[PDB]
Amino acid sequence: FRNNYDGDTVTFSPTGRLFQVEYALEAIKQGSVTVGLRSNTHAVLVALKRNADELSSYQKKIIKCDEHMGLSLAGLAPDARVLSNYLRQQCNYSSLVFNRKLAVERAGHLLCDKAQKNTQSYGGRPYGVGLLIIGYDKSGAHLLEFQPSGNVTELYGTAIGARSQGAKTYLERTLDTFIKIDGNPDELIKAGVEAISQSLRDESLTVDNLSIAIVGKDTPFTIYDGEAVAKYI
Amino acid sequence: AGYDRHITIFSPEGRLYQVEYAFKATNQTNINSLAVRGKDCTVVISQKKVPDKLLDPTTVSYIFCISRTIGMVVNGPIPDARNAALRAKAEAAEFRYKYGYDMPCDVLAKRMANLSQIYTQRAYMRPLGVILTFVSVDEELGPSIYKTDPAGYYVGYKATATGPKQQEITTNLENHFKKSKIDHINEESWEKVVEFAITHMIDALGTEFSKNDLEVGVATKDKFFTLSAENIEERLVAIAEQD
Amino acid sequence: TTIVGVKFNNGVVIAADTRSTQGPIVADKNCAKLHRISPKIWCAGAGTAADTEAVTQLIGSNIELHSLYTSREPRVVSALQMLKQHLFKYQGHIGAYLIVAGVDPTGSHLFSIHAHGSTDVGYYLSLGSGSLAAMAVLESHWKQDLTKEEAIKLASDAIQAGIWNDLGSGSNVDVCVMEIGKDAEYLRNYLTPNVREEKQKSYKFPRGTTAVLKESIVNICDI
Amino acid sequence: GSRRYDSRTTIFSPEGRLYQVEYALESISHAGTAIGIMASDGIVLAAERKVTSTLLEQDTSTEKLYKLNDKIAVAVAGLTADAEILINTARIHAQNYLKTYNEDIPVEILVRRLSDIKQGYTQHGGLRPFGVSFIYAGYDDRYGYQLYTSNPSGNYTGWKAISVGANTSAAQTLLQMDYKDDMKVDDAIELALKTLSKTTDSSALTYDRLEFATIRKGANDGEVYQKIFKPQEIKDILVKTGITK
Amino acid sequence: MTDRYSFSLTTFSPSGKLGQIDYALTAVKQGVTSLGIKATNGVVIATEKKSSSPLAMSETLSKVSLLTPDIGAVYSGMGPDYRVLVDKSRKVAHTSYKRIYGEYPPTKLLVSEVAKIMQEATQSGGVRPFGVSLLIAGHDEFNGFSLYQVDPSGSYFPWKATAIGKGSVAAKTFLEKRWNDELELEDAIHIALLTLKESVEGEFNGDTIELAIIGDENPDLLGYTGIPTDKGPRFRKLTSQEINDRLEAL
Amino acid sequence: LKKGEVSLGTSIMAVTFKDGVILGADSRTTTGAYIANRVTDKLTRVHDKIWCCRSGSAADTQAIADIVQYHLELYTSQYGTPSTETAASVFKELCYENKDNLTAGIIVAGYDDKNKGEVYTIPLGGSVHKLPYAIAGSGSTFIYGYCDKNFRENMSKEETVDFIKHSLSQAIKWDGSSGGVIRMVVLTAAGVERLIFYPDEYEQL
Amino acid sequence: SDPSSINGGIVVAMTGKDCVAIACDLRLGSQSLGVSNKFEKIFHYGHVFLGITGLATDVTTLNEMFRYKTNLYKLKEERAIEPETFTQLVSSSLYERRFGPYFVGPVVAGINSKSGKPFIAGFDLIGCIDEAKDFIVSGTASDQLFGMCESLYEPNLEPEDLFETISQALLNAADRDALSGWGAVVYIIKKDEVVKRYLKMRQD
Amino acid sequence: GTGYDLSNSVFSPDGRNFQVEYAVKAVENGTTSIGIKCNDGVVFAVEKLITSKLLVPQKNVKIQVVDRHIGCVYSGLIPDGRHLVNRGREEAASFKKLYKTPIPIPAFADRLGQYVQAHTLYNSVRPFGVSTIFGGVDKNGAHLYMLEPSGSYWGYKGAATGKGRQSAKAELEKLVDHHPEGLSAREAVKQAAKIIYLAHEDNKEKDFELEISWCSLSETNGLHKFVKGDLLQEAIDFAQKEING
């Protein structure tokens, strides 16, 4: 039973979900929560940095991948690393060769294929990681949700990591306000810190180890760390 | 028996699960085909199963043109039939490129027979459930029917029938070939051979057939051609107006 | 050398000389140039003796293999295609210039192959150093409709013309007649149009002029 | 799936040696006998031929006795098939050594290549081991006569008399007792022919149901002259010993 | 894809058995009667070639293959297995003796090659042996006339006379008495016909029996209708008409 | 390295007429000044309704053409009947990547029943060029004026038959590497018709 | 430098009657300075004798190769290598190396173990087989050797008289060289004894 | 659990392995796509499900081009669809470079088709599990093809799939039957919208976004285009008309 659709990448179900996809979806939640919201001129990521040991020191877990691109993770960190590795390489090859700056949709599609080849051999594997990728290109602002299941939707707002549903319900409500507010950073950032505080219900909110990352028309890729998140709590 | 589905080992039976079931599953499309040779022609008539009005009635095919002379009817599931068709088409052209001579029936049979045997020997490819009826009017071998079956066994036939109603068709061909005392049709004009074929087919399968229920492929010396809807009608028309 | 080919209405005839030379001196009067590939593909070879023999044998092993594999008679049209592609691949760094002839249930065949990677068709064809005299004879007395006797007779006159006016060509003449009805008749030494050479007599050496520094013996097996 | 259709048996037993290897040994002990006797003026090899009948050709007894060299020969205990692959590779290894150093291969040097491949066969690939043991008969000009044995476990030893294949215990017991080092070829043959008798239970033993060879000094060589006996030569020596069996 | 079955699919047990082989040996028995006689005055092979459908012709079926012009082979077992192994057997015979050594192979050395392929497809994982046993009959000046069996095991042995397929034990027995050291090729064709008569009746006619001989030959097909370089190959396979004619005088 | 080299009749053409294309050639191989071939088939079928004229080096053209033949057989069986433009590209690809060894002057002319007759001319180095008619080889410059002025579309078969026989018979006379038979190939939907006329015939006619 | 005439060499083979004869020089040089009067060029395999002329490096490399081929052939077959067979294997080994270096002229002599008849055959670097039963010569002075042999030989010679033909043919052919001096040997081969006789001759 | 559910390195007793059967079942619980063949073109439409107001209208697209004149939409498992298309592109480009022409639809079909068959003859390489409705116009007309999991494809004149298949197919055959094949390309856009709107009635616990495209010989001038602007508003109008509104 278990052993039919677990480790076996070649099998199918009448439903089309294997055990390996449902575990992967659970793995995303076991990382820390990170929320996404965007207008049409900016895209924001608000992410909580909460240490997992007593002595551990805070380190960036939003990683700038290019001038016009980055991602934040939620889920498994090795799994996240390999993909980020391939994407930085991919970014370079497009820029040298075709001068092409990627839109999110294009990268995404690439990302699905990569996972797909590794779910067609027993010696490769599926992943365990979701990613929210922001970027600003000439089609405006973008926020994308990447899933190991290969479901890619470009959204106005989302959340992944634990306790997504706090933030989603707030994000669908303040939707209409935020999307029509263009050229103004500060309101969208502030609103992201409020969203993420509804994801938390019993877990701390840190006033110097929150990290907010933004991209846009008037903003090249900046992560605000330490002090500089203060005036948006 | 053995346990052929989990490891590639033999059975003391001599015949394996992959071979045994390939013998069975070759009909589920509700298909019947026969091939007869004329004195100097070869005719294939095959049931054509257009089951819907969502499909064009002439994209549904089961007779493939492998070469310019050679025809191949595949009796099997349609993915397996096309898998065989693709390979057969390359081997036919590759043989002409290297050896300077178009493909005959028997050499194509042999190549594929060897392939099917290898994939049964492998534990890293599946074999297919296809029965391939290769037909032509070869330049040296005369009129030809060579039919392969799954196993990697093949042999040459007088005439042949395929489908669950193989038996019904057989008794009609037998009766004619004994009567005439030759193992080919006395007739020598592909029209009259096509017409004869249909006659024995109506009789065996017990339903009068339309043009959209048949699909005709004709082989002659140095050419292969398929008969269209109008073309099939002209033959049918006579069988409906004689007793 | 001189090698020819002539088509007749009932078969095809090939002919050759078998002389090999080292300078003017006749190393070998007989040394094969009509090569059996099969009992209905025989082949006449010119250029370098070593390349022509070797490369036909290479083709031959694989052709004898192909005829068997595919369970059918050998074919000139199969050998032809393989020779061209192989000579092409090496770009004619193998100097074998062949006239391949043969008979099948599909007719009489006559082709020639240049080492350049070219194949040819004709109705009479020739190659060799004696190619120019030989072709002259072939092209003139061939006429529409032809017989065994006019074809062998022609074949003979052709190889002689090349013996006579090209003096890098001599010795024995071997002919092989491939009929549609028959198979092949190899007629070894069919015409021997030239003969042995003068002797003036030669004489016992005296033992006061023949000296042996020292004597030993060694065994026939030391292996 | 098919990552669990792996036999996983070319891994260790707790018994200190691989499953398949130990099981294979059994297979040897159920096929033909080879006996190796090293003498002080030869090396005598005897093997009892497995199936002998009229339907077989009885005049052939090289079915398990192959000479690898001019002065090295082997005896097979195991199955024909398994053997052939090592025979061919030992033959080439002989020629590589000959060519590199301008001298013939020493018996242990040759043994050691064969044994490293036998081990190899389970060490790379997961594939199954052999089902053959050789007893090697050879001369080298650095130790006198050498007579060795290798097994698909890749362990090899030298012995002054050994038997492999079926009925190892019985033959070895008798050999240790009658052994001497002042024996000659002919004294060994007589000995060999007694031992073989005592392990085979019969009315009579015939000359065509044996495969025999001895490698003696000779009288056409200061080397060693390898004499491969065929049925009719087996018949002669059977008279000479006066041992009818 | 590859790399999933890299354990051998023969393994041992304390009875030493190799699974695949025992099953495959059984297959040979279930073939048709094929036999070999060395008459020590040639070699004669005969087998049954038989229909499997009323509209299957038998004159498109042969069980006798030429491996080289002067070595012939016959079998019992699986049809496909025999054709594919035969292609590979042909390959080595032609490339490695007729180009390298310039001549036709010696039988016993060709027996070593064919064995090695079969033993190899057992030793390597992911694939099975061939489920056939072949009898390889050949002639050479050096060795005389010869006959070997090569098993599905990749073991070999020589056999003065043998039979394989259905009715193996009785066919070999009757034959052994009728087999003399010095035996006339015509009598040796009768004995073969006689044996195959005992296996089958009610479909036993001479034009369904395929017999081939090592000894008499036709020079006129070897391109020596004209003056010979030499006599050439000794195998020549009978047509049906020759077989039927002798069956009347059986 | 090829030792010696070979040459062909170098005045080749495809002419469009009433119902298709009629393809015309002279044939002659020479190897130096040795007349390797009086007659030749260099009138090459690459598909049943699409033939070509081969010119340039004998060894090279034949070697290419065989490869084109393999692709267009496989092409038919799988992807449906070719076009003149499809054949032309395949010929070109093989010339261009290996223009380091190849000298092929190709006219591929074929008949389609929705494009009518089509002439695609691929010179040395290889580039596909669509024209309504072609002349090629090196003897073509000299008949450029004739051809342009008397070229007419939808001319009677009898009249085109004369026009090709005449066009070449003039070309062959004034040019020197031309010679041997004039062979012609009529391509319409009724099939392929083969014409051969020997030296003594065409000179006169 | 020279491609093979650094050290030179010549080889002659005759047929007699139940008998054959093969003779060669024993020169080794370094360009035109003769350095040694000894270097054997004739080796044999079973009972078929192989003399190889050319460059010393190429005789050595071939000699070790033909040992390798003869031995495995010998082992499988339980039977020695035969003149007739040996000719073909030499052709086939040489044609593979016509694209490699090789600047050799081997000559083969023997008596068959399968029809009792004399056998000689000749090879060049090209690998043209020279089918002969009269004499066959190879080497630098092969042209001259052909003239000497064509005149001097008379058919059907017994070992002593055969010996005299070959020994004198080689001596007078060699006298118009310096690249064929420094001693020379004749082997007169029967299928039961081989007599090896050193001749006395020129040097620089 | 039979090795006819864990491996495709064998033939099944049902002539197909269970996992391929399962791919066919998962297409049907999925999303609806149709394809309408007409006398001068083809029209494509797909239902894009709306689950949140967080999605953006037409900045996620399901109909993706191959070449410039063949339009591809598929229903079923998202990752498998990317991979199929990526392949579809590599074939299409190779064809354009090599033969100097846009690729025919029966040709293009054989190339994808052979690749879907490949991944269904290996014991560890995943099958595809999308059904692709695809097609376009070439130099002998318009063609509509539909490709399945199993590698099965035929030409269609109308095609339907998904959750709302039953409904969709009903309206679709009525209209195709009524028409010579489908009438004008223009008329077909509206019709197409009705089917998708009608199929949406089978799933009202979600919203849809109607998405149409077309590829028409003289009504797109050989190109595949998205259907938008006025042409999308009109098809909506027609749809809400019949299905009350």
Cβ-contact B115, B154 below 8 angstroms:
no
Domain boundaries, chain G: 1-204
The partner residues of H70 in beta bridges, in order of sequence, read H66, H136
Q: Which two three-digit tokens encode residue E141?
A: 């000046």
Residue type, G160: E
H129 with A12: Cβ contact below 8 A: yes
To 10 degrees, the CA torsion angle through E62, E63, E67, E69?
A: -50
Which residues of G fall within a CB distance of 8 Å from E102? 85, 87-89, 91-92
**CA of C127, closest CA in chain F: separation in Å?**
9
CB nearest H127 (choices: A12, A13, A109):
A12
Which residues of H fall within a CB distance of 8 Å from F75? 99
Q: Output the DSSP codes for F122-164.
A: E-TT---EEESSEEEESGGGGGHHHHHHH--SS--HHHHHHHH
Query: What residue ranges in F11-81 does DSSP mark as E strands?
Result: 11-16, 21-26, 29-31, 34-37, 43-47, 50-56
- CA–CA gap between residue A222 and residue A67 (Å, rounded): 10
Which residues of C fall within a CB distance of 8 Å from F38? 122, 139
State the CATH number of the domain containing residue C148.
Answer: 3.60.20.10
Please, what's the b/e burial string for G117-148 (b: 16 or more CB within 10 A of its CB; e: otherwise)?
Answer: ebbbbbbbbebbbbebeebbbbbbbbebbbeb
Fill in the DSSP letter of residue B20: H
Assess whether chains A and B touch, using the rule of 3 or more C-beta pairs within 8 angstroms: no
- Give me the domain span that covers residue H7: 2-244
Burial class (CB in 10 A: 0-12, 13-18, 19+), F62: buried
User: What was the elucidation method?
Assistant: cryo-EM
Q: Which residues contact F60 (CB under 8 A, 6 or more apart)?
A: C117, F101, F102, F103, F104
Cβ-contact A219, A183 below 8 angstroms:
no
Nearest to C10 by CA among C186, C177, C153, C122: C177
Q: Which of C68, C70, C76 to mutate to test the interface with B (most CBs of B within 10 A)?
A: C70
Assess whether chains E and D touch, using the rule of 3 or more C-beta pairs within 8 angstroms: yes
Q: Which of C55, C59, C205 to mutate to test the interface with G (most CBs of G within 10 A)?
A: C205
Breaks (C-N over 2.5 A) in chain B follow: none
Q: For domain G1-204, give its CATH number from 3.30.1180.20, 3.10.310.30, 2.40.50.140, 3.60.20.10.
A: 3.60.20.10
**CA of B139, closest CA in chain C: separation in Å?**
8
D3 with A7: Cβ contact below 8 A: yes
* Spacing of C-alpha E114 from chain mean position: 12
The CA distances from residue C27 to B242, G10, G130, G138, in Å, are 84, 17, 8, 11
E84 with B117: Cβ contact below 8 A: yes
Count of pairs with CB atoms under 8 A, one residue in D, one in G: 15
3-class SS of residue H187:
helix
* Spacing of C-alpha C213 from chain mean position: 48
G89 with E102: Cβ contact below 8 A: yes
Selecting among H2, H31, H101, H161, the annotated active-site residue is: H31
Active-site residues of F, by number, are 10
The CA distances from residue C88 to B42, C112, F99, in Å, are 40, 15, 15
Cβ-contact G190, G181 below 8 angstroms:
no
Assess whether chains C and B touch, using the rule of 3 or more C-beta pairs within 8 angstroms: yes
3-class SS of residue B190:
helix
**Domains of chain A listed by start with CATH number:** 3-233 (3.60.20.10)
CA angle G121, G126, G129 (to 5 degrees): 25
- Give me the domain span that covers residue D76: 1-244
E15 with D26: Cβ contact below 8 A: yes
C121 with F29: Cβ contact below 8 A: no
**CA of F45, closest CA in chain B: separation in Å?**
13
Fill in the DSSP letter of residue H150: T
**CA of B156, closest CA in chain E: separation in Å?**
5
Phi and psi at residue A66, in whole multiples of 5°?
-165, 180
Nearest to B153 by CA among B175, B131, B126: B131
Cβ-contact F44, C128 below 8 angstroms:
no
Cβ-contact E4, E120 below 8 angstroms:
no
The verdict on F102 touching C (C-beta cutoff 8 Å) is: no
The verdict on E95 touching G (C-beta cutoff 8 Å) is: no
* Spacing of C-alpha C163 from chain mean position: 14
Q: How far apart are the first and last CA of chain G?
A: 20
Q: Output the DSSP codes for chain E.
A: --SS--S-S----TT---HHHHHHHHHHHTS--EEEEE-SSSEEEEEE---SSTTB-STT--S-EEEETTEEEEEEE-HHHHHHHHHHHHHHHHHTTSSSSSSPPPHHHHHHHHHHHHHHHHHSTT----SEEEEEEEEETTTEEEEEEE-TTS-EEE-SEEEESSSHHHHHHHHHHH--SS--HHHHHHHHHHHHHHH--SS--GGGEEEEEES---GGGTT-SSS-S-----EEEPPHHHHHHHHTT-
The number of domains in chain D is 1
- CA–CA gap between residue A9 and residue A123 (Å, rounded): 10
The CA distances from residue C107 to C66, C110, D45, H140, in Å, are 20, 10, 64, 42
Q: Which residues contact C196 (CB under 8 A, 6 or more apart)?
A: none
Cβ-contact G112, G82 below 8 angstroms:
yes
Cβ-contact H192, H43 below 8 angstroms:
yes
Cβ-contact A35, A128 below 8 angstroms:
no
Touching partners of G (3+ C-beta pairs < 8 Å): C, D, E
Nearest to D193 by CA among D210, D173, D176, D215: D210
C184 with E226: Cβ contact below 8 A: yes
Which residues of H fall within a CB distance of 8 Å from E1? 122-125
A13 with H22: Cβ contact below 8 A: yes
Fill in the DSSP letter of residue D39: -
- Own/partner contacts of H168-177, CB < 8 Å, gap of 24 or more, are H168/H32, H168/H34, H168/H195, H168/H196, H168/H198, H168/H199, H169/B54, H171/H195, H171/H198, H172/B54, H172/H34, H172/H36, H173/B53, H173/B54, H176/B53, H176/B54, H176/H36, H176/H37, H177/B53
The verdict on B107 touching F (C-beta cutoff 8 Å) is: no
Resolution of the determined structure in angstroms stands at 8.8
Alpha helices in chain D (DSSP H): 19-28, 80-101, 107-123, 168-178, 185-198, 231-240
**Domains of chain F listed by start with CATH number:** 7-205 (3.60.20.10)
Q: For domain E1-249, give its CATH number from 3.30.460.80, 3.40.50.300, 2.170.270.10, 3.60.20.10.
A: 3.60.20.10
The number of domains in chain H is 1
CB nearest E126 (choices: B2, B123, B158):
B123
**CA of H187, closest CA in chain F: separation in Å?**
29
State the CATH number of the domain containing residue H136.
Answer: 3.60.20.10
Q: How far apart are the first and last CA of chain A?
A: 50
Domain boundaries, chain E: 1-249
Assess whether chains A and C touch, using the rule of 3 or more C-beta pairs within 8 angstroms: no
Which residues of B fall within a CB distance of 8 Å from F77? 65-67, 89, 92-93
Residue with tokens 């077909």: H188
- CA–CA gap between residue A26 and residue A17 (Å, rounded): 14
Q: Which residues contact E121 (CB under 8 A, 6 or more apart)?
A: B121, E127, E128, E129, E130
